[PDB]
Design a protein around this ligand. Structure first.
Ligand SMILES: CN[C@@H](C)C(=O)N[C@H](C(=O)N1CC[C@H](C)[C@H]1C(=O)Nc1ccccc1-c1ncccn1)C1CCCCC1
Ligand SMILES: [Zn+2]
Length: 94
């Protein structure tokens, strides 16, 4: 939940989109990169450059931002981009 990104080398959106150059999975690569994720090159495993949170086993029609907020609500990239209200809404039911 720190304000300092875990992986500065992947802070650049262009650095992240590059990792998806040959992405074959259903979840949209631009949406993934915009949501802070880069591909690890091992199945559909991705990692956020900021919070360091990893996610795998993406399902059809899943939204990168929603999943990001669900699993890593303390991510400060998410807070900076989407804002707290977005995070609040994802966690509304619990
Ligand atoms: C359906 N949408 C996807 C994006 C999603 O929610 N992925 C989750 C995920 O990647 N998680 C959950 C938190 C965890 C830090 C991360 C993860 O890396 N999980 C694992 C990765 C490799 C090996 C095991 C796990 C794992 N182990 C125990 C419980 C959950 N995941 C998780 C994958 C396994 C089945 C439950 C869901
Ligand atoms: Zn994050």
């Amino acid at each position: 939940s720190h304000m300092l990104p875990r992986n500065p080398s992947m802070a650049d959106y262009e650095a992240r989109i590059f990792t998806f150059g040959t992405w074959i999975y259903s979840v949209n690569k631009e949406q993934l990169a915009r949501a802070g994720f880069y591909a690890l090159g091992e199945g559909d495993k991705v990692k956020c450059f900021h919070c360091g949170g990893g996610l795998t086993d993406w399902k059809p029609s899943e939204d990168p931002w929603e999943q990001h907020a669900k699993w890593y609500p303390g991510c400060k990239y998410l807070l900076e981009q989407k804002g707290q209200e977005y995070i609040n809404n994802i966690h509304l039911t619990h």
